[PDB]
């Protein structure tokens, strides 16, 4: 009644793009949680920096309690590791989003490679009136799989560079973090899910 | 033009699904009627058991109660199989009403908002094909939910007058108004299937 | 080696993106020439079909006009092969653009593989204030090499429909031709050249 | 030498008149295409009058028919102006073939009757300039007479396949063979116009 080996691929794509929509919801909800956390990191960086600049100076009024610099710094560093532990939780969310898309798309590609020689090179390239061609369907999932892995690299490397000291770098964290998004293609996954939004509801 | 072929296609699929509904309703009425006669046949045998001698235990009562139950559960699966069949049809009905719904979604933009809508065939605007697909959907959506309730309560009930009314609702189907047959012809005569 | 083993890669990128800028200009100047060529193919298809339908006609005006039905058909096919030959010239332009970028990017990636173990994983990922990171510089050239190669395949296969001779199929050539463009990443080569516009003038 | 310069002069005018013919034919094809769109727009309006068959489309039939007439006669006068333009070219073309026609008539006579033929340029005898001037003339004499017939019948017809074929003959001109551009180069290279 219909082409059988194409239904297995069409159902694989009908089940894959709704997963990408869920993963993008957690991916975006995690990057939003990193906006105020890195802002408070830059704040604690300024406090630690100003305190370190005036840790060798001797203001006469604060000389009454010379054990003040040690207590103030410890309290600042405690609030710093609290922000770092919560930021690590958000990296775990971005890691989960990356692992889900990088594995489900590979499973959809296994279904495609099962019928790669049987569907025919002509049936894949042919598009519909509202559904893009099956070739564009798979290549767009590869571009989404690249976008999440290429961004997760920048998110993880930048959030591991803060541990390497550098009091000035952790003060400019939101400046380079917001650069990661603007330098990449932020409006890419939302456009692929838009062109295939007609293919999902049959 | 593409909207005209898909509207004519929906007009055909709307007719085909109705025929599948009335056919499954006959097989479902046969299964349900056999359940009603099974309830009455057990009551008639219960009257024969009361007319039996006092020096008799449940010799055939244990055999009949197991065969009666096993046949009842078999008829419950047979009637439920008819329910699932009508549900798959109703899903396709919703697929026909959303497809028609999309046809007019692109028809209302093609002619702005200040020009009249040219009829897709001879005397029917694209919007009117939705108002029929929506009402026809609402009717069989109500009918499906009723047939579910009647099927569940038919096996559970023991009231004779309630069992009779159960078969009456499955038979004629109340929610399917008599005007469904005329609106179906108004579709096929327009799309070009039935000769004008 | 140089005082900085990465300078050999930055010099390769400073010479590669201006080349991609030239190739995109020829790539687009050829696709614009294909809009009226496919329109004239659909136009001649409508003329050829209507003229072939009228082989049984007896027009009173057609009196004293010898070989008019015969010459018109030959003349239509001559003007058709001229449009086909011009479309073949545009495919040669799109293929040359593809072979240029696919060769310059491979040469830039060979220069990178010479110092992959000597430049350091930190120098590549590190961006500047106005120039993106050298890693994104190479990865963007990988996306550009994909865009030209993945489009050239669709451009040639869709323009192979002329082999069917179907007057209805070649009448919808400009309809499906504009679909290839809009479905691709139209604002990609011009957008990558925008982020690197600060790196080139250094 | 004066007959030789006039052969080169006519050879130049033959190229200029060909360019004037194809240029006026382009403006004529725009007018003819507008005539076709006027016939199609009137047929499209005739279907709109049958759709909105209220007692206001039979009045707009008179309004549209008058705008159709005023624009049709304007396009017929515009197309006739293109015919007259191509006719002035054809008059100059007959004047180029008749001017050449006199040159060899007295050139073979000046030296008795076939004694020796002096080449007007390097190779081409004076007679060969006739075989080009006459073929080029006869090609555009047929083409002009055809374009006249197409102009008259295009406004009268209503058949779509006939309208397309009418525009087809006008765009790519049939009677002018494709080899006409080569025969012109074979004469321009001879007379000295085309660069050696």
How many Å apart are CA A133 and CA A125, to the nearest integer? 5
Residues of chain C contacting A181 with CB distance shorter than 8 Å:
none
Give one word for C50, left, alpha or beta, with left for phi > 0 and alpha for psi -120 to 50: alpha
Q: How was this model experimentally determined?
A: X-ray
Give the CA count within 13 Å in the CB-facing half-sphere of D73: 5
Out of C51, C75, C78, name the one closest to residue D165 (CB).
C51
Give every CB contact of residue B25 below 8 A, 6+ residues apart in sequence. B82, B86, B170, B173
How many Å apart are CA C197 and CA C202, to the nearest integer? 10
How many Å apart are CA D173 and CA D167, to the nearest integer? 10
Residues of chain B contacting D44 with CB distance shorter than 8 Å:
none
How many Å apart are CA A158 and CA A94, to the nearest integer? 14
A117, A189 Cβ separation under 8 angstroms = no
Give every CB contact of residue B82 below 8 A, 6+ residues apart in sequence. B24, B25, B27, B28, B31
Residues D65-91 as b/e (b if ≥16 CB within 10 A, e otherwise) read eeeeeebbeebbebbbebbebbeebbe
Q: Distance of alpha carbon C137 from its chain centroid, rounded?
A: 22
How many Å apart are CA C57 and CA D159, to the nearest integer? 12
**Closest residue by Cα to residue A141 from A20, A43, A11:** A20
- Residue numbering of the annotated binding site of B for Na(+): 186
B147, B90 Cβ separation under 8 angstroms = no
* SS3 label, residue B57: coil
Give, as one character, the DSSP assignment of residue C8: H
**Closest residue by Cα to residue A45 from A17, A69, A26, A73:** A73
**Total Cβ atoms within 10 A of residue D137:** 20
**Closest residue by Cα to residue D165 from A158, C69, C176, C74:** C69
How many Å apart are CA A174 and CA B185, to the nearest integer? 67
Asked if D168 and C51 come within 8 Å (Cβ–Cβ), the reply is: yes
Whole-angstrom CA distances from D96 to A126, D4, D101, D134, D182 are 58, 14, 8, 10, 19
In chain C, which residue's Cα lies nearest the Cα of A122?
A: C157
Q: Which helix (H) or strand (E) holds C79?
A: helix C68-114
D131, D168 Cβ separation under 8 angstroms = no
How many Å apart are CA C145 and CA C102, to the nearest integer? 6
The subunits that touch chain B, with at least 3 C-beta pairs less than 8 Å apart, are A, D
The subunits that touch chain D, with at least 3 C-beta pairs less than 8 Å apart, are B, C
**Total Cβ atoms within 10 A of residue B3:** 17
How many Å apart are CA C84 and CA C158, to the nearest integer? 14
A93, A30 Cβ separation under 8 angstroms = yes
Asked if C61 and D178 come within 8 Å (Cβ–Cβ), the reply is: no
How many Å apart are CA A11 and CA A202, to the nearest integer? 10
* SS3 label, residue A131: coil
In chain D, which residue's Cα lies nearest the Cα of C75?
A: D174
- Tokens representing B128? 């009117």
Asked if A127 and C179 come within 8 Å (Cβ–Cβ), the reply is: yes
Give the C:D interface size as CB pairs under 8 Å.
43
In chain B, which residue's Cα lies nearest the Cα of D50?
A: B122
**Total Cβ atoms within 10 A of residue B34:** 15
In chain C, which residue's Cα lies nearest the Cα of A156?
A: C125
**Total Cβ atoms within 10 A of residue A84:** 15
Q: Distance of alpha carbon B46 from its chain centroid, rounded?
A: 35
Specify burial of residue B62 (Cβ count, 10 A radius: 0-12, 13-18, 19+): exposed
Give every CB contact of residue D130 below 8 A, 6+ residues apart in sequence. D97, D100, D101, D104
C145, C102 Cβ separation under 8 angstroms = yes
- Tokens representing C68? 């008019």
How many Å apart are CA A170 and CA A176, to the nearest integer? 10
**C-alpha R_g of chain A:** 25
- Tokens representing D88? 């002035």
How many Å apart are CA C42 and CA C76, to the nearest integer? 12
Give every CB contact of residue D62 below 8 A, 6+ residues apart in sequence. none
How many Å apart are CA B154 and CA A94, to the nearest integer? 54
**Closest residue by Cα to residue A6 from A106, A155, A100, A135:** A135
**Closest residue by Cα to residue D129 from D22, D111, D91, D121:** D121
**Widest CA span of chain D, in angstroms?**
87
Asked if C125 and A157 come within 8 Å (Cβ–Cβ), the reply is: yes
Do C and A share at least 3 CB pairs under 8 Å? Answer: yes
Whole-angstrom CA distances from C1 to A188, C8, C106 are 40, 9, 21
**Total Cβ atoms within 10 A of residue C179:** 15
Asked if C150 and A139 come within 8 Å (Cβ–Cβ), the reply is: yes
D57, D48 Cβ separation under 8 angstroms = yes
Asked if D52 and B119 come within 8 Å (Cβ–Cβ), the reply is: no
Give one word for B91, left, alpha or beta, with left for phi > 0 and alpha for psi -120 to 50: alpha
C46, C167 Cβ separation under 8 angstroms = yes
How many Å apart are CA A38 and CA A45, to the nearest integer? 10
Distance from CA of B127 to the nearest CA of D (A): 17
DSSP string computed for D59-77:
HHHHHHHHHHHHHHHHHHH
Q: Vertex A20, ends A14 and A26: CA angle to 5°?
A: 145
**Measured in Å, how far apart are chain D's first and last C-alpha atoms?**
21
Alpha helices, H only, D111-179: 128-156, 160-171
Q: Which residues of D touch B (CB under 8 A)?
A: 51-52
How many Å apart are CA B94 and CA B141, to the nearest integer? 9
Best D165, D169, D171 member to test C by mutation, with max C CBs in 10 Å, is D165
Asked if D52 and B116 come within 8 Å (Cβ–Cβ), the reply is: yes
Out of D153, D161, D175, name the one closest to residue C50 (CB).
D161
Q: No. of H helices and E strands in chain A?
A: 7, 0
A95, A151 Cβ separation under 8 angstroms = no
How many Å apart are CA C22 and CA A154, to the nearest integer? 31
D130, D136 Cβ separation under 8 angstroms = no
Best A121, A123, A124, A125 member to test C by mutation, with max C CBs in 10 Å, is A125
In chain B, which residue's Cα lies nearest the Cα of D53?
A: B123
A90, A34 Cβ separation under 8 angstroms = yes
D90, D140 Cβ separation under 8 angstroms = yes
- Residue numbering of the annotated binding site of D: 186
Which residue is associated with the tokens 């029917």? B124
DSSP string computed for B154-174:
HHH---HHHHHHHHHHHHH-S
How many Å apart are CA B46 and CA B60, to the nearest integer? 11
How many Å apart are CA D133 and CA D10, to the nearest integer? 9
Nearest 10 degrees: Cα torsion A97, A101, A104, A109: -170
Give the A:C interface size as CB pairs under 8 Å.
19
Backbone angles phi, psi at D125, to 5 degrees: -65, 165
Specify burial of residue D98 (Cβ count, 10 A radius: 0-12, 13-18, 19+): exposed
Residues preceding chain discontinuities in chain C with C to N over 2.5 Å: none
How many Å apart are CA C50 and CA C14, to the nearest integer? 56
How many Å apart are CA A86 and CA A93, to the nearest integer? 11
Tallying the residues shown for chain A, one arrives at 202
How many Å apart are CA D37 and CA D31, to the nearest integer? 10
Q: Vertex B38, ends B151 and B54: CA angle to 5°?
A: 135
- Tokens representing A193? 């899910």
Asked if A129 and B2 come within 8 Å (Cβ–Cβ), the reply is: yes
Whole-angstrom CA distances from C157 to C152, C160, C165, D101, D148 are 9, 5, 15, 56, 44
Asked if A201 and B98 come within 8 Å (Cβ–Cβ), the reply is: yes
Q: Which helix (H) or strand (E) holds C99?
A: helix C68-114
Q: Distance of alpha carbon B87 from its chain centroid, rounded?
A: 8
Give, as one character, the DSSP assignment of residue D175: S
- The interface residues of chain C toward chain D in range 4-63, judged by CB-CB distance below 8 A, are 46-47, 50-51, 53-54, 57, 59, 61
Residues of chain C contacting A138 with CB distance shorter than 8 Å:
none
Give, as one character, the DSSP assignment of residue A119: S
How many Å apart are CA D82 and CA B192, to the nearest integer? 47
- Tokens representing B164? 């009779």
DSSP string computed for C123-159:
HHH---SSS--HHHHHHHHHHHHHHHHHHHHHHHHHT
**Total Cβ atoms within 10 A of residue C67:** 10
């Amino acid at each position: 009644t219909q082409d059988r080996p194409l239904l297995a691929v069409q159902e694989a794509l009908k089940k894959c793009f709704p997963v990408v929509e869920e993963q993008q919801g957690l991916w975006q909800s995690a990057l939003r949680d990193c906006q105020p956390l890195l802002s408070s990191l830059s704040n604690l960086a300024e406090q630690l920096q100003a305190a370190q600049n005036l840790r060798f100076e001797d203001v006469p009024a604060l000389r009454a309690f010379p054990d003040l610099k040690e207590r103030l710094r410890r309290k600042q560093l405690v609030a710093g590791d609290i922000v770092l532990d919560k930021l690590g939780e958000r990296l775990a969310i971005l890691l989960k989003v990356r692992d889900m898309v990088s594995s489900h798309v590979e499973r959809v590609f296994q279904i495609y490679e099962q019928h790669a020689d049987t569907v025919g090179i002509d049936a894949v390239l042919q598009p519909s009136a509202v559904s893009p061609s099956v070739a564009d369907m798979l290549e767009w999932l590869q571009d989404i799989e690249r976008h999440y892995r290429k961004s997760y690299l920048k998110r993880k490397y930048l959030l591991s560079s803060i541990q390497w000291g550098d009091l000035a770098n952790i003060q400019a964290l939101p400046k380079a973090w917001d650069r990661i998004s603007k330098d990449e293609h932020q409006d890419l996954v939302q456009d692929i899910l838009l062109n295939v939004s007609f293919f999902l509801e049959e | 033009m593409v909207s005209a072929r898909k509207i004519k296609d929906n007009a055909a699929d709307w007719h085909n699904l109705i025929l599948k509904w009335e056919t499954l309703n006959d097989a479902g009425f046969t299964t349900a009627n056999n359940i009603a006669n099974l309830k009455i046949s057990l009551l008639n045998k219960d009257k024969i058991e009361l007319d039996s001698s006092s020096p008799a235990s449940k010799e055939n009562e244990e055999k009949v109660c197991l065969e009666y139950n096993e046949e009842l559960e078999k008829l419950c699966e047979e009637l439920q199989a008819t329910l699932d069949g009508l549900t798959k049809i109703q899903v396709k009905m919703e697929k026909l009403s959303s497809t028609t719904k999309g046809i007019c979604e692109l028809e209302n933009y093609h002619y702005g908002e200040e020009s009249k809508r040219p009829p897709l065939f001879h005397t029917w605007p694209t919007t009117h094909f939705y108002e029929v697909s929506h009402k026809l959907l609402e009717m069989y959506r109500k009918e499906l939910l009723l047939k579910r309730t009647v099927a569940k309560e038919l096996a559970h009930t023991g009231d004779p007058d309630l069992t009779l009314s159960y078969l009456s609702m499955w038979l004629h189907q109340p929610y399917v108004e008599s005007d469904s047959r005329l609106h179906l012809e108004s579709m096929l005569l327009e799309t070009g299937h039935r000769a004008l």
